[PDB]
Amino acid sequence: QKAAALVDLAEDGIGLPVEILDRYYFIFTRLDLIWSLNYFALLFLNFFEQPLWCEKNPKPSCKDRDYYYLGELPYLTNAESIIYEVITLAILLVHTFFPISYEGSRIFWTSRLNLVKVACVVILFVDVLVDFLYFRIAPYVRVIIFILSIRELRDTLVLLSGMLGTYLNILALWMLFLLFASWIAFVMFEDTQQGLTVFTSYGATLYQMFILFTTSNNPDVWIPAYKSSRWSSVFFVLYVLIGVYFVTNLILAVVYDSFKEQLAKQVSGMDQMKRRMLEKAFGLIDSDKNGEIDKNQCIKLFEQLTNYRTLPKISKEEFGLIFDELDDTRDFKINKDEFADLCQAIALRFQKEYHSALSQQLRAFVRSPNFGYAISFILIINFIAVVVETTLDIEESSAQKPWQVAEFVFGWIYVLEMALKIYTYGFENYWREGANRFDFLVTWVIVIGETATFITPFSNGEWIRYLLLARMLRLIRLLMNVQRYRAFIATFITLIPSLMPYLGTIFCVLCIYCSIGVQVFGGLNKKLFETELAEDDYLLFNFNDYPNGMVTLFNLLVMGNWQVWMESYKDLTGTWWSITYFVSFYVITILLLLNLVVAFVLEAFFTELDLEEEEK
């Protein structure tokens, strides 16, 4: 009946899942709940197509492919590129044809998102056939399509814009600070030592003061001036003090507040949609369209929410006397708004979510705490076994087999545990809790490890087995029982998945800034390449290939000696208008995104503290 349809709607809205219509929509979404899973791997592989792709560097140039400090394995032949791109674009084409099913023809192409999706698809197609028969913006539309493909990154982008609004203003003020400070600094050391300051007039001093602002060149950049006079330092310290602890911090504060504001905006935009779900449910169960529901119409919805969703109580005549007790007046009173708060309160404060003989013997013992204690002690002896095997491999006193085979059969004990636990709990019930999913993937990489190690053909054993000691990382959850380190560990655990859309966003930003590196900074040998610098002759073993560009972009992201990539390339291309790359990168990923994730970590920790204080 319509009532049951409601129960599904209320339970789904409670689970925060929802559609966007108003039985085609139903059955089509049901067809989507499986296709989305393959679509995820599709998007991830299509994204990984970009780093595995060939480059524009070996393209009509000599003499590829050798090792002029450029490249790491592997690459892609143009044919494999063709077929792979064709496959991914085909499944993607299906993934773009599919949402038109549970939508109107004039409705689908009307949304700002879908038309952009299709546009990126036809761009990727008009580029895949051309790239086949024959390449610039081709990798860009891949990461672009990917970012908007997943809503949990789309919302993040909306957020980021919503704060970049004022972030531009605080950036302008920062720019003013830089300009003035650089001017005063330049006019301070004009007709004295040294040459590194005066070398390229004012612009050089602005450049170097900007690099001093990130403190990635602090001891050195004013070292000659300090050698001249010691009191010179009194300037620079004052510049750092006022620069890093005063300015940068309140920049972080600006990004903080802006983020919090836009986030409150986002969840405010979420509650409205959820309310739309609940009001849809009530609107459907209210056949008379009076705006209210009666007990003879309410206890059935309650009963359905009991039988199909959560567990409250039992409905009898006692229930009738209960409804007759709340007012000693009748009948009956529940409206469109009280119903929502009732559903929310029930879903919140109350509970949530073959022969029955041979299986029920284990289905009652696996739910017992004895099983958890079993796998606990198992991962303990697993720990001591692993640390022994490893501590004997480092002493080369092996005697490696009797322990590593034991860790293999430990992996077998883990796949046994995983199998019986995924069997006794459920197909989707075991998949709901994320920890069990982590254990699921760890196990399912352990077994493909077993296929790769035992079936077809040592050191590979040590490698592909010791890495999966992260299965024993769940033993650290024990520390939450201590009121000293509870909030910390809990915050971390809740941070692992919640910080993921931001990390993924900035990762995609890196994947966007890498294509720029391949397209512009292809050429790395030469006279310039060997001239400067010292460790830069070692540090520049990258940014020529794509994974190299990615990991050196990481090296920029940690701000560890980052400027050595900025300057060594500056005099590698010749033009100063190359550094505009680096700066931009910084000002996009250091003063914005990293401050954002700092803000989010802080806010998450405070939320955890407020939760622990709430339950007190």
- Among candidate residues 210, 52, 50, the one with its CA nearest the CA of residue 139: 50
The answer to whether 593 and 156 have CB atoms below 8 angstroms apart is no
The answer to whether 136 and 518 have CB atoms below 8 angstroms apart is no
In angstroms, the CA 528 to CA 9 distance is: 66
Position of minimal CB gap to Ba ion: 191
The answer to whether 602 and 255 have CB atoms below 8 angstroms apart is no
The one segment of 183-191, 285-293, 347-355, 368-376 that binds a second copy by CB under 8 A: 183-191
Interacting partner of 131 out of a second copy, Ca ion, Ba ion, none (Cβ under 5 to 8 A depending on kind): Ca ion
The one segment of 15-23, 129-137, 176-184, 288-296 that binds Ba ion by CB under 5 A: 288-296
291 binds Ba ion (CB under 5 A): yes
Which CB atom, from 261 or from 393, has the smaller least distance to Ba ion?
393
Contacts (Cβ under 8 Å, ≥6 apart) of 20: none
Site for Ba ion, residues 316 to 375, rule: CB under 5 A: none
616 binds a second copy (CB under 8 A): no
127 binds Ca ion (CB under 5 A): no
| DSSP assignment letter at 478 | G
Name residue 125's amino acid.
F
What is the nearest approach in angstroms of Ca ion to the Cβ of residue 1? 15
Apex CA 173: angle with CA 171 and CA 178, to 5°?
90
What is the nearest approach in angstroms of a second copy to the Cβ of residue 573? 21
72 binds Ca ion (CB under 5 A): no
Contacts (Cβ under 8 Å, ≥6 apart) of 422: 430, 440
Binding mask 575-604 for a second copy (x = CB under 8 A): -------------------x--xx--xx--
Binding mask 530-559 for a second copy (x = CB under 8 A): ----xx--xx-x-----xx--x--xx--xx
The one segment of 34-42, 218-226, 277-285, 570-578 that binds a second copy by CB under 8 A: 218-226
b (16+ CB within 10 A) / e for 95-110: bbebbeebbeeeebee
What is the pairing mode between strands 334-335 and 292-293? antiparallel
Q: What token pair was written down for 121?
A: 């698809």
296 binds Ca ion (CB under 5 A): no
Binding mask 100-129 for Ba ion (x = CB under 5 A): ------------------------------
In angstroms, the CA 83 to CA 88 distance is: 9
Apex CA 223: angle with CA 222 and CA 226, to 5°?
90
190 binds a second copy (CB under 8 A): yes
Interacting partner of 144 out of Ca ion, a second copy, Ba ion, none (Cβ under 5 to 8 A depending on kind): none
Task: List, in sequence order, the alpha helices (H) in 241-363.
Answer: 249-285, 295-308, 317-323, 338-349
DSSP for 286-306, written as a single string: -TT-SSEE-HHHHHHHHHHHH
In angstroms, the CA 180 to CA 182 distance is: 5
488 binds a second copy (CB under 8 A): yes
What is the nearest approach in angstroms of a second copy to the Cβ of residue 30? 38
- Of 22, 191, 395, 614, the one binding Ba ion (CB under 5 A) is 191
97 binds a second copy (CB under 8 A): no
Interacting partner of 433 out of Ba ion, a second copy, Ca ion, none (Cβ under 5 to 8 A depending on kind): none
Which CB atom, from 186 or from 513, has the smaller least distance to a second copy?
186
Contacts (Cβ under 8 Å, ≥6 apart) of 395: none
The phi, psi pair for 592, rounded to 5°, reads -115, -65
279 binds Ba ion (CB under 5 A): no
75 binds a second copy (CB under 8 A): no
72 binds a second copy (CB under 8 A): yes
Site for Ba ion, residues 475 to 514, rule: CB under 5 A: none
Which CB atom, from 424 or from 542, has the smaller least distance to a second copy?
542
286 binds Ca ion (CB under 5 A): yes
What is the nearest approach in angstroms of a second copy to the Cβ of residue 233? 5
Interacting partner of 291 out of Ca ion, Ba ion, a second copy, none (Cβ under 5 to 8 A depending on kind): Ba ion
Interacting partner of 254 out of Ca ion, Ba ion, a second copy, none (Cβ under 5 to 8 A depending on kind): a second copy
- Of 46, 57, 81, 542, the one binding Ca ion (CB under 5 A) is 81
389 binds Ca ion (CB under 5 A): no
b (16+ CB within 10 A) / e for 479-490: eeeeeeeebebb
Please tell me whether residue 201 adopts helix, strand or coil conformation.
helix
Q: Which residues pair with 292 in a beta bridge?
A: 335
- Of 111, 169, 201, 290, the one binding Ca ion (CB under 5 A) is 290
334 binds a second copy (CB under 8 A): no
Number of C-beta neighbours around residue 592 at 10 A: 21
- Of 230, 289, 349, 616, the one binding a second copy (CB under 8 A) is 230
49 binds Ca ion (CB under 5 A): no
CA atoms in the 13 A half-sphere facing the CB of 175: 9
240 binds a second copy (CB under 8 A): yes
Count the site residues for Ca ion by CB under 5 A: 6
175 binds a second copy (CB under 8 A): no
Count the site residues for a second copy by CB under 8 A: 75
Number of C-beta neighbours around residue 363 at 10 A: 14
- Among candidate residues 94, 87, 99, 173, the one with its CA nearest the CA of residue 132: 87
Interacting partner of 200 out of Ba ion, a second copy, Ca ion, none (Cβ under 5 to 8 A depending on kind): none
The answer to whether 162 and 262 have CB atoms below 8 angstroms apart is yes
Please tell me whether residue 334 adopts helix, strand or coil conformation.
strand
In angstroms, the CA 516 to CA 316 distance is: 70
Tell me which residues touch Ba ion (CB under 5 A). 190-191, 291, 393
Tell me which residues touch Ca ion (CB under 5 A). 81, 85, 131, 286, 288, 290
